[PDB]
Design a protein around this ligand. Structure first.
Ligand SMILES: OC[C@H]1O[C@@](CO)(O[C@H]2O[C@H](CO)[C@@H](O)[C@H](O)[C@H]2O)[C@@H](O)[C@@H]1O
Ligand SMILES: OC[C@H]1O[C@@](CO)(O[C@H]2O[C@H](CO)[C@@H](O)[C@H](O)[C@H]2O)[C@@H](O)[C@@H]1O
Ligand SMILES: OC[C@H]1O[C@@](CO)(O[C@H]2O[C@H](CO)[C@@H](O)[C@H](O)[C@H]2O)[C@@H](O)[C@@H]1O
Ligand SMILES: [Cu+2]
Ligand SMILES: [Cu+2]
Ligand SMILES: [Cu+2]
Ligand SMILES: [Cu+2]
Ligand SMILES: [Cu+2]
Ligand SMILES: [Cu+2]
Lengths: 345, 345, 345
């Protein structure tokens, strides 16, 4: 009885996003997505530590889905028989049945089709939630992503002016809880079920061993740094399904930030650092003004530098010496300088 | 010299709330409340672990007090001689004398009467705060609750429109720090003073052993799930006197959320997850649109599923298939399906 | 080529602030500041525990710098040859080159001059960030402070009304990670490099051993309590470069709070407790209404009372019995009282 046009969307691996319109004059459609659960061993840090992960579509995070207010979203969730456990999906964007989790529980070898109406704008988490202690375990094993529900007129500044991004990236942050042996080395396991008991003990102490973007320490540095150009307005969606985070663009700002992630609320302006509450997605716009490397971190700097939570942007363009300049390069402290008379000595 | 009508309020145990008017045309009154401290052993999880608690009025949290802007609140605090320690009360709603703590210190066998003017609207924490290390210990032992100071015109949406709730619940979240023996089992004690030294060591590492609503894991699930009906606008007050929390209604949203808890500020709309800073109360309105079970959690899912922090609502009414529907029930993955050609394989 | 007046600013040790205008009719200037790195052993708690600190200008936090929107800020950063490590500076207020860190790396015996344009209003963190694991280590060793960029018209309430403070204090909160020996006693070291390996292990578990204001437990209590007077509007800037905090003025409120710290956003009103995300500075105004002692804490009360995070204000003036009064002093519970019939017994 729901007589609307159907459109199939092909998702892409984060931190990229499938193509979409920002503002649209198309009416509501049924937007069709497919997510396939994949349990597999994954490498999660620069020393090669492996982890028994569980994913949507083989990535941590799962891919970003993008629709417009009033669309219907029809998700086929597939759990191949190569997997060992039941899985489901819960959309924080959806209304009813535990976000869809109570309608999508599938054993290996099965698939299910859920439809939810996109009545709430913003970026939102989706994650697996099978029941009881399996909920946190599936989520911290990798089974979470995000969906963006755009207004049909695209984003605005909360004061009646349109905003448009030239570029979008999705940064999924994952807290991981990897057991260690008596000597302090990370332990390896042959299957998720084998890893569970030891992993649950680490989870109970609430302190992650790794905090990563795009599934691994160093995923978005080096060759895989994020590209941008001076003058571009870049939307950075950030999600964390289980634990708080405090994003910060080193050398930049958040020009417009929806830290609670919901476009019915005006963004805040000119933030240094914002706050993603565990169990949510937020979004920040920034117009790059300077070329060079930027680090994007959670600004618990221990997590950023020592547990894996740093991405880079590589921005091309011309340097603006009015905004910042090195007036004098490093030089020997003048013989004549008198710093021993300063108030704090 | 304060010549206003007096009205005695009988409090009730959370998560229920004493009856009150939302909007009122009554002028300011002296609203009289009594809180009696009770130290006692309490059961805090589904395995029967017991805990040396300290409470206001025998419950964790202490009861919700509800008054209107401009009322005076006259609290008789009683510390029966069956108790072993001094106690006091500090209202985050009040101005002066450490919130009242510096005027309310009572030994066992004594009572004291404090009056504070309700000049600030919102939901606010109250808690015991005897002095020094006793402050966190009394609070994490259970001695905290909340007070709501309504505008005289009731709540509004921050844009000039009245909001009215059909139902109110108060969810007090408690972080607990229970010692374990060498084998990892929770230890039992015969008195609060006996529990102190071992408990302070757990407190110092800042990681709770239990995170509970209404005083115990499973308190608000099963027979004690919270009731609602499709169409009702429900106000959920949430407090945490010592530690942050990130509330989330699984399958719903926060239609209007005051996460910092103060009604002079417009609420945010359409939240997935909000944030209660430790030492505060916040509030969310939601109009139920779908029947069924909802879980209300902190969305650190480890705390929610494994440390006790899940409540349920049981909502009666008719399902809306437009908002969400199971298009196809779980079925075998079609022989003809081609998932091995997906980009992530 | 930048032809503006230069003005030298002499900084002062926190929690005080160098003199400045709030509103100004002066045009943009080049505001010249000097920061000298000092590595030294410091006492950090009331038991005399010492710590291998690294500081700007010999204090934790580093001093508050105050300029106006559109000023240029020219910082000479000095690293004396008595220091052992390279250092740099990153301003969250600045645009480009990792906030200045990529232009300011200096070895012992060198100095460098950085200029950044103050294009963003608010309070912002600055901190050392040499590269890789040295970033969190230098920051949690003490190398962080804040800068305030005022609008030229001074502060406003976000609704078109000027706000002016009579008094300003800067509270820098520091999370510290001090190793312990097998017996649980804090370990002492002869140099920062000697302390590193053991300190990094404590840092990795993300749980501080001390959380302090102005560099030490008890720094702002006793003789060094903060002064104020009934009727004064006091601005409290609070920063935390690495870890979240939840400030609360016990016995007061935040009348106007910019918890994300940026003056382009209207403040929230009448807060009990606010939230400083790690990696940021926020600010609260409060007009004192009552004399006496107030405690200013982070409202994780364990951190406040047991890990060092309490300051005091001592406020002079006349008590207002309308706002709060002790109606009846502590007295024996009346023989006739009937508390055994209360609902919770
Ligand atoms: O309360 C009536 C009864 O209806 C049930 C039957 O399973 O299902 C309702 O809710 C489901 C979503 O949770 C819908 O898919 C279904 O169509 C609707 O009838 C039970 O939940 C309930 O006990
Ligand atoms: O500064 C004068 C002196 O007055 C004291 C006496 O105890 O009390 C004032 O403040 C109290 C609340 O903290 C009020 O109950 C009292 O009525 C008021 O006089 C001292 O705090 C102070 O040293
Ligand atoms: O992309 C060109 C090239 O210019 C460099 C040379 O070091 O420097 C630019 O950016 C610096 C700030 O990071 C400015 O101080 C400098 O003036 C500007 O030319 C390189 O970063 C870059 O590879
Ligand atoms: Cu799963
Ligand atoms: Cu969820
Ligand atoms: Cu008490
Ligand atoms: Cu308090
Ligand atoms: Cu340094
Ligand atoms: Cu920084």
């Amino acid at each position: 009885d729901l007589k609307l046009p159907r459109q199939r969307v092909d998702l892409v691996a984060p931190p990229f996003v499938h193509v979409h319109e920002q503002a649209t004059k198309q009416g509501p459609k049924i937007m069709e997505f497919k997510l396939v659960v994949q349990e597999k061993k994954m490498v999660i840090d620069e020393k090669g530590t492996t982890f028994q992960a569980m994913t949507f579509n083989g990535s941590m995070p799962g891919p970003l889905m993008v629709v417009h207010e009033g669309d219907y979203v029809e998700v086929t969730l597939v759990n191949p028989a190569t997997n060992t456990m039941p899985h489901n999906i819960d959309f924080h964007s959806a209304t009813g049945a535990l976000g869809g989790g109570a309608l999508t529980l599938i054993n290996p070898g099965e698939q299910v089709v859920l439809r939810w109406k996109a009545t709430r704008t913003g970026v939102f988490v989706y994650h697996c939630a099978p029941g009881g202690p399996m909920i946190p375990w599936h989520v911290v094993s990798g089974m979470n992503g995000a969906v963006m529900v755009l207004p049909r007129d695209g984003l605005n500044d909360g004061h009646g002016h349109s905003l448009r991004y030239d570029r979008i990236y999705y940064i999924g942050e994952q807290d991981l809880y990897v057991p260690r042996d008596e000597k302090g080395n990370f332990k390896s396991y042959d299957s998720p079920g084998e890893a569970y008991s030891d992993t649950e003990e680490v989870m109970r102490k609430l302190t992650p061993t790794h905090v990563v973007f795009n599934g691994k320490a160093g995923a978005l540095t080096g060759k895989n740094a994020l590209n941008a150009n001076v003058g571009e307005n870049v939307l950075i969606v950030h999600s964390q399904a289980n634990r708080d985070s405090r994003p910060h663009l080193i050398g930049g700002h958040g020009d417009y930030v929806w830290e609670t992630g919901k476009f019915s609320n005006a963004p805040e302006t000119g933030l240094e650092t914002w706050f993603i509450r565990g169990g949510s997605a937020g979004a920040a716009l920034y117009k790059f003004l300077q070329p060079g490397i930027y680090a994007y971190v959670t600004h618990n700097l221990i997590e950023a530098a020592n547990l894996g939570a740093t991405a880079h942007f590589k921005v091309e363009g011309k340097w603006n010496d009015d905004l910042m300049t090195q007036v004098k390069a490093p030089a020997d402290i003048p013989t004549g300088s008198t710093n021993e008379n300063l108030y704090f000595q």
